[PDB]
Amino acid sequence: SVTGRIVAMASGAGRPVWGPRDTVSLMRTGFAGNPVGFRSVKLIAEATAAVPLICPVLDLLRRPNAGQGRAELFEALIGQILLSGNGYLEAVCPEPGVPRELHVLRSDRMAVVPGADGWPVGYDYTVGGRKHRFDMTGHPDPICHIKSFHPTDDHYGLSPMQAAAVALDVHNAASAWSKALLDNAARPSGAIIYKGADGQGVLAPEQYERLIFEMETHHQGARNAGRPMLLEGGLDWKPMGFSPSDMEFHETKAAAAREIALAFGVPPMLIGIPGDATYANYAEANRAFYRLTVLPLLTRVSAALAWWLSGYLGAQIELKPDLDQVPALAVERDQLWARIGAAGFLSNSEKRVLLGLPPT
Amino acid sequence: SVTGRIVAMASGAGRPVWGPRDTVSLMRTGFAGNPVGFRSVKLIAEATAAVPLICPVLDLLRRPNAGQGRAELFEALIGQILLSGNGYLEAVCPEPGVPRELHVLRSDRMAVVPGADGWPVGYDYTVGGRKHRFDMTGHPDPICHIKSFHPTDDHYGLSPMQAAAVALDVHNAASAWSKALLDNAARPSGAIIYKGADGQGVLAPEQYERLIFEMETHHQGARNAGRPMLLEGGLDWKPMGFSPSDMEFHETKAAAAREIALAFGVPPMLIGIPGDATYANYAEANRAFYRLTVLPLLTRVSAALAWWLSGYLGAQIELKPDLDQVPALAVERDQLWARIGAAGFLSNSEKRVLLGLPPT
Amino acid sequence: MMLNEVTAVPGTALPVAEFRDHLRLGTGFADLGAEDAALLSYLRAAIAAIEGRTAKALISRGFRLALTAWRWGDMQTLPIAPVATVTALRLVDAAGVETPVAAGWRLVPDMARPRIEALGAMLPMIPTGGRVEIDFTAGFGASWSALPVDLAQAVFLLAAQYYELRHDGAAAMPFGVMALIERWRTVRVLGGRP
Amino acid sequence: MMLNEVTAVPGTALPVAEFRDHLRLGTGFADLGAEDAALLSYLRAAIAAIEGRTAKALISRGFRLALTAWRWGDMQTLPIAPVATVTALRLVDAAGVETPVAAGWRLVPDMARPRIEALGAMLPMIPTGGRVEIDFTAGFGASWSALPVDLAQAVFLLAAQYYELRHDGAAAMPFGVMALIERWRTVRVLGGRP
Amino acid sequence: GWASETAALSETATPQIDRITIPLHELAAMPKASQRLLDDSAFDIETW
Amino acid sequence: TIRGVLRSTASLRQIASVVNVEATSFDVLVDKTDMGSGWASETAALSETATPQIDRITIPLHELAAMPKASSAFDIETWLANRIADKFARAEAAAFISGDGVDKPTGFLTKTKVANGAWAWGSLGYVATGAAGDFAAVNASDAVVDLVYALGAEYRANASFVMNSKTAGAVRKMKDADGRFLWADSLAAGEPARLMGYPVLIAEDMPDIAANAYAIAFGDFGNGYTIAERPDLRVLRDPFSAKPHVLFYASKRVGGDVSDFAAIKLLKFAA
Amino acid sequence: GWASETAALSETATPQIDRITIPLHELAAMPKASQRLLDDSAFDIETW
């Protein structure tokens, strides 16, 4: 905070700081463009919305606004964090405490203002040429700004799609390689070469319609596969091939489809990409998914809702994921109940306090 | 909210916003065109209809209208969400509460109107050149608009088929590659080259019917396979081959047939596409299907029916998937009943309350 | 796409008096005897052999390019390469109402790929059945002196050959006829859909 | 990109009196001038052959480079290679108005890459539907003596050939016509986008 | 049109609209009654 | 981050009456004259004293358009959107002050000015300074103070000066017979921003001091000048017309002239 | 430009983008110090 004043002047106080320009184009080319970048965010954002929470405040979260439910809110919230590294939540307060409206402001059209002491004073929702200038020079601070970790930038997040932005363009263009190869390719199944007495000679349109009708009827198609095809003088049939037949950038697409899944943190088994068996039997890969890239993400966002929404209340509230009755963690729950349940030496109430039960 | 009021006047208030251009063409080329895109939607839409629900209001859902049952409604509803990212439900209310008609309006012919404050005021059902202009400037709001998550658009969904639109055109054209290769191809099983004394020379139609009849009778067919075939002076037999025989875009189709199944989120094992064994033994892949792409999808639509239909009632109703006696989740139910049933330390009534039983 | 010439050369524009000097001047039998109007008939045969191999025009004759459908959305490369000033882009309909247009297109001149390249993305659409028709003047200059002189020498190396030997008789020069033409041929590598 | 010449060579700058010394015509005859009309007809036909194989200029006549869109964002390599003192990048408009622009463009002299690189990171913009012609005088020198002499010899090896054989009749030197040209041709290996 | 789009019809003639004004005049009658007649008569002339 | 030249931002938008309008035009309705009531006589006819003739002034609500062609270090979509909003904030400022009638809002300087004291409704009133080149030589600032006190006490509750930078320069150049800077006395003060108790708006589209130019204005522009506009900004992110250049289309529509001819008073630098 | 209704507005001038180069020159000092003078004196010469 003491050094906060020094970085603020360099950027320029009172003026909007934009950060990354090409953020909106990674969405259309990397999330609406390829299925791997599409499925990876949809797999996470529909997983963090499904996790229950532990606190009143959750009555706001259950019904944030019209037409945007509890689970639909976090899909919009985490879906901006995975896409552009930043999450925004406007609170509309007709009432003084616990404001009854939440709105995920998209992070394409939002810009920060550094202000005096380096910590932000303005946020600017910029649609068309129109700005809004939300104000942070107050106590309730009407927008929570959830940052992904960015080491070099002081105001935004890193957005894992930016780290995979080369592997998206490999997977977008290798998939479009095979598309435009199926659309721009002339393979013939042969060529009836007609030289003539000279090195060059055309055949007359009388002879040419004769050549079609014996080729149309008697030689093409499945039903004429293999006629013995008499070739008189001058004529010759050179059959062409198609030498790379399968596998046009097949492994570099399948390797880039795994590096996209690597950056968002989904395992290759969940998304459905082919590859070597790393995880075994989905009791691991679903448990690894909710432990390395979902529950760390959800306990970081819920820790920002636990502090931003407590600024509207008087008492501070904690708000964490449940990490109980989330059915992907049952292999960590069998393993912990059967450990203490088999420990017969310590008594009955001495293990209800370990497994989390109210003792009797 | 406040940002929304500014967003409206950028696009234009009171005027219809259409969104996706090609969504009428992705249906014919991606859902009536290929089996992989066809089966993937049919696998999900017939799964969400089979899941029971927990609440009167469900009496409407059981029998919405004539000729369109309960299970047939959600197949129509989810079948529009997977195809075009948007679900629509018209309600006809002769009576004030619990309107006795539901109709899945197709999302090709529906368009939104942003209205004044950014949240929609009109929906326009446009068939031919004829409109309807449903009105949202009231409390019951006669159409629930279920959005898939779209980060860039403010009014529509993303429609996973749009994310797989490259892999559909690969799979459609590679499959049509082999069709038209079996239909336009002239392979011969040889060529009887007849040069002559000159470099060129035809053979007379007397000699040519002799040449057919000794080829028609004595050399072609299974029964003449391998006759020793005397070749006098001038005649010569050059046997042709067919150098790419199998496997015309065989793996690039099979990789694209997996990326379509990847985008909708079905596992490769359920749909029947070939590929490396990711899931093991169908107790997982069916359990993965009802946990990563069905029950998150079904708990998101049911959360919108719980709020739109409660606008017709006085009291608000919750409406969630059962997540019980759905037989793909039996491996999550064995694992949880045998954990607590073997926990002999805590008493009998202390585990009926954990497993969800009525206590005794 | 018929692309007939409106008018041919006058004949008096051709360098018949100069071609007699390329035939035998400074060395030779004398001026000798040459059927004058014969020598004009070999220059028109050597220019029309180099107008075809180079797709150039060389005298700046008037053309009429009447084609039915536009190939691209807006581009319309013109075949006869050195162009200047579209005379008119009149547009006839299936009955022959012949309604010209005067704006919407800007000819972009070039020796490589002359174009029509309309403004924006809208090039004048075609009446169904009513072929579009473009009149233009293509070539280097009105007189023989306005030509590139290396291309003019390829005419004189060729028109003298048709004068020196009549039938197709057999006979590797460094800059022959063929080596002077190749920097004026059209180098194209498209066999595709656009 | 049209690249026409404003003015041709004067003809009096060509060394007809020295080309006559090359071809061994004759020394002290009283006629001495029966070939003057044709000797410079082959010198202009051999320079224009070597101006196209080398993309050089050799007499420093004035050019006019009328083009519409810039080839690269800022560079704009000129075709005719040995340049000096680009006169005017007058920027015409869609129709009519021609405004010469100092515009903050430089000129990078080179025999291989005669660029016109801009200093403000962007050349002067182009009015949509209008061309940007560049007047520049490109060549080695004004008179014949300012040439590289090996390239001047390659004209004399070539124009002597056109004088000695008229039609394309076939007929190995260490430094022939071709081996003198090849250190003046443009060596390029880019077929790419930039 | 069908083939007129190629030759002409770069724009289709829009409907030239027209405003017809209802001037909204008033219809007023002012009959004059006497105060003697309004008081003497058994017939309620004021409501007749 | 790409930089640009920083232009003036003060635009007369924050002191004039900004009205959100949705139709094609905005009609303000001002009566031109008084009731004309007289003291009645005890034995007189006393009828039809007078009636204020009303007048509709039409804000035409013109449109403003700028059309640049776009032709990964800095991102053009955000930067060009942050430049074209500045140009639409600055180009309407010239129309608000010295715009003419054709296709653009007519500024308050272009309204057929009449010398104050012979002031009628159809014009704006001015006060003369003295010599034609500049302020008066004998007593400077007398033109400023009687410009203030020749307006009307009801509009001077919230009125402001409108100048450009180098007219406020020539105002701060005023000094007494010892040279002690009548406005902001020391060389250590700065812009005092409260000229004659009233705020100053440095609007660069005002003319400078010339032979007859009206370089200083003063008024309650909340009643005087009405800016009627639509708040949004059109954003056509065009992916057609030219593949090479995006050629974004951005437009804001805005109109305005004077609603009240009594609020604004001008300073003519002449005799 | 203020766009008329019957104008069919032309495209305007895209602002020229300038690119000014900082050359980033070097500035170095090379003092020559004696080894004995650095080893004998009481002052921290490498610091001074």
Side-chain angles (χ1 to χ4, degrees), chain A residues 92-129 131-134:
Chain A
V92 176
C93 50
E95 295 292 326
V98 57
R100 63 179 179 87
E101 296 287 326
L102 291 176
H103 295 281
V104 173
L105 297 176
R106 55 180 292 181
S107 55
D108 289 332
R109 301 183 300 187
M110 186 63 72
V112 304
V113 174
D117 293 332
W119 62 276
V121 176
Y123 289 96
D124 296 334
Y125 189 80
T126 63
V127 63
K131 299 174 73 69
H132 189 273
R133 184 59 63 87
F134 296 105

CSV table of all heavy atoms in Angstrom, one decimal, chain A residues 92-134, unseen atoms left out:
chain,number,residue,atom,x,y,z
A,92,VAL,N,-26.8,-4.2,-7.2
A,92,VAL,CA,-27.8,-3.1,-7.2
A,92,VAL,C,-28.5,-3.2,-5.9
A,92,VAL,O,-29.1,-4.2,-5.5
A,92,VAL,CB,-28.7,-3.3,-8.4
A,92,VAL,CG1,-29.8,-2.2,-8.3
A,92,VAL,CG2,-28.0,-3.2,-9.7
A,93,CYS,N,-28.4,-2.0,-5.2
A,93,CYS,CA,-28.9,-1.9,-3.8
A,93,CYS,C,-30.0,-0.9,-3.7
A,93,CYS,O,-29.8,0.3,-3.4
A,93,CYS,CB,-27.8,-1.6,-2.9
A,93,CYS,SG,-26.7,-0.2,-3.3
A,94,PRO,N,-31.3,-1.3,-3.9
A,94,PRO,CA,-32.4,-0.4,-3.6
A,94,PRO,C,-32.5,-0.3,-2.1
A,94,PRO,O,-32.9,0.8,-1.6
A,94,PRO,CB,-33.6,-1.1,-4.2
A,94,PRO,CG,-33.1,-2.0,-5.2
A,94,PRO,CD,-31.8,-2.5,-4.7
A,95,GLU,N,-32.3,-1.3,-1.3
A,95,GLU,CA,-32.2,-1.5,0.1
A,95,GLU,C,-30.7,-1.3,0.5
A,95,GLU,O,-29.8,-1.4,-0.2
A,95,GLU,CB,-32.6,-3.0,0.4
A,95,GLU,CG,-34.0,-3.3,0.1
A,95,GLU,CD,-35.0,-2.6,1.0
A,95,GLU,OE1,-34.6,-2.3,2.2
A,95,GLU,OE2,-36.1,-2.2,0.6
A,96,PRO,N,-30.5,-0.9,1.8
A,96,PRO,CA,-29.1,-0.6,2.2
A,96,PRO,C,-28.3,-1.9,2.4
A,96,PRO,O,-27.1,-1.9,2.0
A,96,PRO,CB,-29.3,0.2,3.5
A,96,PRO,CG,-30.7,-0.3,4.0
A,96,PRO,CD,-31.5,-0.5,2.8
A,97,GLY,N,-28.8,-2.9,3.0
A,97,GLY,CA,-28.0,-4.1,3.3
A,97,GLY,C,-28.5,-5.2,2.4
A,97,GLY,O,-29.6,-5.3,2.0
A,98,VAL,N,-27.5,-6.1,2.2
A,98,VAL,CA,-27.6,-7.3,1.3
A,98,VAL,C,-28.3,-7.1,0.0
A,98,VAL,O,-29.5,-7.3,-0.1
A,98,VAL,CB,-28.1,-8.6,2.1
A,98,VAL,CG1,-29.5,-8.5,2.8
A,98,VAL,CG2,-28.0,-9.8,1.2
A,99,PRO,N,-27.7,-6.4,-1.0
A,99,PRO,CA,-28.3,-6.0,-2.2
A,99,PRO,C,-28.9,-7.1,-3.0
A,99,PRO,O,-28.2,-8.1,-3.3
A,99,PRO,CB,-27.2,-5.2,-2.9
A,99,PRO,CG,-26.0,-5.8,-2.4
A,99,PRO,CD,-26.2,-6.3,-1.0
A,100,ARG,N,-30.1,-7.0,-3.4
A,100,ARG,CA,-30.9,-8.1,-4.0
A,100,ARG,C,-30.7,-8.3,-5.5
A,100,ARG,O,-31.5,-9.0,-6.1
A,100,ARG,CB,-32.4,-7.9,-3.6
A,100,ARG,CG,-33.0,-6.7,-4.2
A,100,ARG,CD,-34.5,-6.6,-3.8
A,100,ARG,NE,-35.2,-5.5,-4.3
A,100,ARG,CZ,-35.8,-5.4,-5.5
A,100,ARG,NH1,-35.8,-6.5,-6.2
A,100,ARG,NH2,-36.4,-4.3,-5.8
A,101,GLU,N,-29.7,-7.8,-6.1
A,101,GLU,CA,-29.4,-8.0,-7.5
A,101,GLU,C,-28.0,-8.3,-7.7
A,101,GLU,O,-27.1,-7.5,-7.1
A,101,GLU,CB,-29.8,-6.8,-8.3
A,101,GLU,CG,-31.3,-6.5,-8.3
A,101,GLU,CD,-32.1,-7.4,-9.1
A,101,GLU,OE1,-31.6,-7.9,-10.1
A,101,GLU,OE2,-33.3,-7.7,-8.7
A,102,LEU,N,-27.6,-9.3,-8.4
A,102,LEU,CA,-26.3,-9.6,-8.9
A,102,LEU,C,-26.3,-9.7,-10.4
A,102,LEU,O,-27.1,-10.4,-10.9
A,102,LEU,CB,-25.7,-10.8,-8.2
A,102,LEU,CG,-25.4,-10.6,-6.7
A,102,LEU,CD1,-24.9,-11.9,-6.1
A,102,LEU,CD2,-24.4,-9.5,-6.5
A,103,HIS,N,-25.3,-9.2,-11.0
A,103,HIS,CA,-25.2,-9.2,-12.5
A,103,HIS,C,-23.7,-9.4,-12.9
A,103,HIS,O,-22.8,-8.6,-12.5
A,103,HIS,CB,-25.7,-7.9,-13.1
A,103,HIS,CG,-27.2,-7.7,-12.9
A,103,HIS,ND1,-28.1,-8.4,-13.7
A,103,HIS,CD2,-27.9,-7.0,-12.1
A,103,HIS,CE1,-29.3,-8.1,-13.3
A,103,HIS,NE2,-29.2,-7.2,-12.3
A,104,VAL,N,-23.4,-10.5,-13.6
A,104,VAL,CA,-22.1,-10.7,-14.1
A,104,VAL,C,-21.8,-9.8,-15.3
A,104,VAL,O,-22.4,-10.0,-16.3
A,104,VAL,CB,-21.9,-12.2,-14.5
A,104,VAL,CG1,-20.6,-12.4,-15.2
A,104,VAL,CG2,-22.0,-13.1,-13.3
A,105,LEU,N,-21.0,-8.8,-15.1
A,105,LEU,CA,-20.6,-7.9,-16.1
A,105,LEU,C,-19.5,-8.6,-16.9
A,105,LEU,O,-18.5,-9.1,-16.3
A,105,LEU,CB,-20.1,-6.6,-15.6
A,105,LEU,CG,-21.3,-5.9,-14.8
A,105,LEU,CD1,-20.9,-4.6,-14.2
A,105,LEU,CD2,-22.4,-5.7,-15.8
A,106,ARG,N,-19.6,-8.6,-18.2
A,106,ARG,CA,-18.6,-9.3,-19.0
A,106,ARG,C,-17.4,-8.5,-19.1
A,106,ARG,O,-17.4,-7.3,-19.0
A,106,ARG,CB,-19.2,-9.6,-20.4
A,106,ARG,CG,-19.7,-8.4,-21.1
A,106,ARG,CD,-20.2,-8.6,-22.5
A,106,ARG,NE,-19.1,-9.0,-23.4
A,106,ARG,CZ,-19.4,-9.3,-24.7
A,106,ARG,NH1,-20.6,-9.2,-25.2
A,106,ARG,NH2,-18.4,-9.7,-25.5
A,107,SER,N,-16.2,-9.2,-19.1
A,107,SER,CA,-14.9,-8.6,-18.9
A,107,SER,C,-14.3,-8.2,-20.3
A,107,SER,O,-13.2,-7.7,-20.2
A,107,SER,CB,-14.0,-9.6,-18.2
A,107,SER,OG,-14.0,-10.8,-18.9
A,108,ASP,N,-15.0,-8.3,-21.4
A,108,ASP,CA,-14.5,-7.7,-22.6
A,108,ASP,C,-14.7,-6.2,-22.5
A,108,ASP,O,-13.8,-5.5,-22.9
A,108,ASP,CB,-15.3,-8.3,-23.8
A,108,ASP,CG,-15.0,-9.7,-24.1
A,108,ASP,OD1,-13.8,-10.1,-23.8
A,108,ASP,OD2,-15.8,-10.4,-24.7
A,109,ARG,N,-15.8,-5.8,-22.0
A,109,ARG,CA,-16.2,-4.4,-22.1
A,109,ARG,C,-16.0,-3.7,-20.8
A,109,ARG,O,-16.5,-2.5,-20.6
A,109,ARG,CB,-17.7,-4.3,-22.5
A,109,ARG,CG,-17.8,-4.9,-23.9
A,109,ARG,CD,-19.2,-4.8,-24.4
A,109,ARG,NE,-20.2,-5.4,-23.6
A,109,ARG,CZ,-21.5,-5.6,-24.0
A,109,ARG,NH1,-21.9,-5.2,-25.2
A,109,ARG,NH2,-22.4,-6.2,-23.2
A,110,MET,N,-15.2,-4.3,-19.9
A,110,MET,CA,-14.9,-3.7,-18.6
A,110,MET,C,-13.4,-3.2,-18.5
A,110,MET,O,-12.6,-4.0,-19.0
A,110,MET,CB,-15.2,-4.6,-17.4
A,110,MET,CG,-15.0,-4.1,-16.1
A,110,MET,SD,-16.2,-2.7,-15.8
A,110,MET,CE,-17.7,-3.7,-15.7
A,111,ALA,N,-13.2,-2.1,-18.0
A,111,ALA,CA,-11.8,-1.5,-17.9
A,111,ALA,C,-11.6,-1.0,-16.5
A,111,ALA,O,-12.5,-0.4,-15.9
A,111,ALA,CB,-11.6,-0.5,-18.9
A,112,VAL,N,-10.3,-1.1,-16.0
A,112,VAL,CA,-10.0,-0.6,-14.7
A,112,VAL,C,-9.5,0.8,-14.7
A,112,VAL,O,-9.2,1.4,-15.8
A,112,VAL,CB,-8.9,-1.5,-14.1
A,112,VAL,CG1,-9.4,-3.0,-14.1
A,112,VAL,CG2,-7.6,-1.4,-14.8
A,113,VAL,N,-9.5,1.5,-13.6
A,113,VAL,CA,-8.9,2.8,-13.4
A,113,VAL,C,-8.0,2.7,-12.2
A,113,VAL,O,-8.4,2.2,-11.1
A,113,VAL,CB,-10.0,3.9,-13.2
A,113,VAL,CG1,-9.3,5.2,-12.9
A,113,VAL,CG2,-10.8,4.1,-14.4
A,114,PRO,N,-6.7,3.0,-12.3
A,114,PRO,CA,-5.8,2.8,-11.2
A,114,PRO,C,-6.0,3.7,-10.0
A,114,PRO,O,-5.9,3.2,-8.9
A,114,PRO,CB,-4.4,3.1,-11.9
A,114,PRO,CG,-4.6,2.9,-13.3
A,114,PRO,CD,-6.0,3.4,-13.6
A,115,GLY,N,-6.4,5.0,-10.2
A,115,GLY,CA,-6.7,5.8,-9.1
A,115,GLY,C,-5.4,6.3,-8.4
A,115,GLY,O,-4.3,6.3,-9.0
A,116,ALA,N,-5.6,6.8,-7.2
A,116,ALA,CA,-4.5,7.5,-6.5
A,116,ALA,C,-3.4,6.5,-5.9
A,116,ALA,O,-2.3,6.6,-6.2
A,116,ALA,CB,-5.0,8.4,-5.4
A,117,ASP,N,-3.9,5.6,-5.0
A,117,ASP,CA,-3.0,4.8,-4.3
A,117,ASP,C,-2.8,3.4,-4.9
A,117,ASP,O,-2.4,2.5,-4.3
A,117,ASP,CB,-3.5,4.6,-2.9
A,117,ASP,CG,-3.5,5.8,-2.0
A,117,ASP,OD1,-2.6,6.7,-2.3
A,117,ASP,OD2,-4.3,6.0,-1.1
A,118,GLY,N,-3.0,3.3,-6.2
A,118,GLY,CA,-2.8,2.1,-6.9
A,118,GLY,C,-3.9,1.1,-6.9
A,118,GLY,O,-4.1,0.3,-7.9
A,119,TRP,N,-4.7,1.1,-5.8
A,119,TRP,CA,-5.8,0.2,-5.8
A,119,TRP,C,-7.0,0.9,-6.5
A,119,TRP,O,-7.1,2.2,-6.4
A,119,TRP,CB,-6.2,-0.2,-4.4
A,119,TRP,CG,-6.5,1.0,-3.5
A,119,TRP,CD1,-5.7,1.8,-2.9
A,119,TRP,CD2,-7.8,1.5,-3.3
A,119,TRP,NE1,-6.3,2.8,-2.2
A,119,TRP,CE2,-7.7,2.6,-2.4
A,119,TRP,CE3,-9.1,1.1,-3.6
A,119,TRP,CZ2,-8.8,3.4,-1.9
A,119,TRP,CZ3,-10.2,1.9,-3.2
A,119,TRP,CH2,-10.0,3.0,-2.3
A,120,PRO,N,-7.9,0.2,-7.2
A,120,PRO,CA,-8.7,0.9,-8.2
A,120,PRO,C,-9.8,1.8,-7.6
A,120,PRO,O,-10.3,1.6,-6.5
A,120,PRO,CB,-9.4,-0.3,-9.0
A,120,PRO,CG,-8.4,-1.4,-8.7
A,120,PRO,CD,-7.9,-1.2,-7.4
A,121,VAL,N,-10.1,2.8,-8.4
A,121,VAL,CA,-11.1,3.8,-8.1
A,121,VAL,C,-12.3,3.7,-9.0
A,121,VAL,O,-13.5,3.9,-8.7
A,121,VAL,CB,-10.5,5.2,-8.0
A,121,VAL,CG1,-11.6,6.3,-7.7
A,121,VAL,CG2,-9.5,5.2,-6.9
A,122,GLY,N,-12.0,3.4,-10.3
A,122,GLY,CA,-13.1,3.3,-11.3
A,122,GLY,C,-13.0,2.0,-12.1
A,122,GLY,O,-12.0,1.4,-12.4
A,123,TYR,N,-14.2,1.5,-12.4
A,123,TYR,CA,-14.4,0.5,-13.4
A,123,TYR,C,-15.4,1.0,-14.5
A,123,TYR,O,-16.3,1.7,-14.1
A,123,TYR,CB,-15.0,-0.8,-12.8
A,123,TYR,CG,-13.9,-1.5,-11.9
A,123,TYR,CD1,-13.9,-1.3,-10.6
A,123,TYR,CD2,-13.0,-2.3,-12.5
A,123,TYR,CE1,-12.9,-1.9,-9.8
A,123,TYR,CE2,-12.0,-3.0,-11.8
A,123,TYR,CZ,-12.0,-2.8,-10.4
A,123,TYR,OH,-11.1,-3.4,-9.6
A,124,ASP,N,-15.1,0.7,-15.7
A,124,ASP,CA,-15.8,1.4,-16.8
A,124,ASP,C,-16.4,0.3,-17.7
A,124,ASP,O,-15.7,-0.5,-18.4
A,124,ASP,CB,-14.8,2.2,-17.7
A,124,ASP,CG,-14.3,3.3,-16.9
A,124,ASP,OD1,-14.9,3.8,-15.9
A,124,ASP,OD2,-13.2,3.8,-17.2
A,125,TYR,N,-17.7,0.2,-17.7
A,125,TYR,CA,-18.4,-0.7,-18.6
A,125,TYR,C,-18.7,0.0,-19.9
A,125,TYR,O,-19.5,0.9,-20.0
A,125,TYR,CB,-19.7,-1.2,-18.0
A,125,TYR,CG,-20.3,-2.3,-18.8
A,125,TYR,CD1,-19.9,-3.6,-18.6
A,125,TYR,CD2,-21.4,-2.1,-19.6
A,125,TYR,CE1,-20.4,-4.6,-19.3
A,125,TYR,CE2,-21.9,-3.1,-20.4
A,125,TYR,CZ,-21.4,-4.4,-20.2
A,125,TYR,OH,-21.9,-5.4,-20.9
A,126,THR,N,-17.9,-0.3,-20.9
A,126,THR,CA,-17.9,0.4,-22.2
A,126,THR,C,-18.5,-0.3,-23.3
A,126,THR,O,-17.8,-1.1,-24.0
A,126,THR,CB,-16.4,0.8,-22.5
A,126,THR,OG1,-15.6,-0.4,-22.7
A,126,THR,CG2,-15.8,1.6,-21.4
A,127,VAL,N,-19.8,-0.1,-23.6
A,127,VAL,CA,-20.5,-0.7,-24.7
A,127,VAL,C,-20.7,0.4,-25.8
A,127,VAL,O,-21.2,1.5,-25.4
A,127,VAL,CB,-21.8,-1.3,-24.3
A,127,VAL,CG1,-22.7,-0.2,-23.7
A,127,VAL,CG2,-22.5,-2.1,-25.4
A,128,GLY,N,-20.3,0.2,-27.0
A,128,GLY,CA,-20.4,1.2,-28.0
A,128,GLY,C,-19.4,2.3,-27.6
A,128,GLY,O,-18.3,2.0,-27.3
A,129,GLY,N,-19.9,3.5,-27.6
A,129,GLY,CA,-18.9,4.6,-27.2
A,129,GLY,C,-19.3,5.0,-25.8
A,129,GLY,O,-18.7,5.9,-25.2
A,130,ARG,N,-20.3,4.3,-25.3
A,130,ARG,CA,-20.9,4.6,-24.0
A,130,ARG,C,-20.2,4.0,-22.8
A,130,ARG,O,-19.9,2.8,-22.8
A,130,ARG,CB,-22.4,4.2,-24.0
A,131,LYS,N,-19.8,4.8,-21.8
A,131,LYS,CA,-19.2,4.4,-20.6
A,131,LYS,C,-20.1,4.5,-19.4
A,131,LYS,O,-21.3,5.0,-19.6
A,131,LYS,CB,-17.9,5.2,-20.3
A,131,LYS,CG,-16.8,5.1,-21.3
A,131,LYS,CD,-15.7,6.1,-21.0
A,131,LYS,CE,-14.9,5.5,-19.8
A,131,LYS,NZ,-14.1,4.3,-20.2
A,132,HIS,N,-19.7,3.9,-18.3
A,132,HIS,CA,-20.6,4.1,-17.1
A,132,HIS,C,-19.8,4.7,-15.9
A,132,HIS,O,-20.4,5.5,-15.2
A,132,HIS,CB,-21.2,2.8,-16.7
A,132,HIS,CG,-22.2,3.0,-15.6
A,132,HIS,ND1,-21.9,3.0,-14.2
A,132,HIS,CD2,-23.5,3.2,-15.6
A,132,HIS,CE1,-23.0,3.2,-13.5
A,132,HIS,NE2,-24.0,3.4,-14.4
A,133,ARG,N,-18.6,4.3,-15.7
A,133,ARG,CA,-17.7,4.8,-14.5
A,133,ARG,C,-18.4,4.4,-13.2
A,133,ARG,O,-19.0,5.3,-12.5
A,133,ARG,CB,-17.4,6.2,-14.7
A,133,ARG,CG,-16.4,6.8,-13.6
A,133,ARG,CD,-15.1,6.0,-13.6
A,133,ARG,NE,-14.4,6.2,-14.8
A,133,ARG,CZ,-13.5,7.1,-15.1
A,133,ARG,NH1,-13.3,8.1,-14.1
A,133,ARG,NH2,-12.9,7.2,-16.2
A,134,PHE,N,-18.3,3.1,-12.9
A,134,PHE,CA,-18.6,2.7,-11.5
A,134,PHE,C,-17.5,3.3,-10.6
A,134,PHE,O,-16.4,3.5,-11.0
A,134,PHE,CB,-18.5,1.2,-11.4
A,134,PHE,CG,-19.6,0.5,-12.2
A,134,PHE,CD1,-19.2,-0.1,-13.4
A,134,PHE,CD2,-20.9,0.4,-11.8
A,134,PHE,CE1,-20.2,-0.8,-14.2
A,134,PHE,CE2,-21.8,-0.2,-12.5
A,134,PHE,CZ,-21.5,-0.8,-13.7
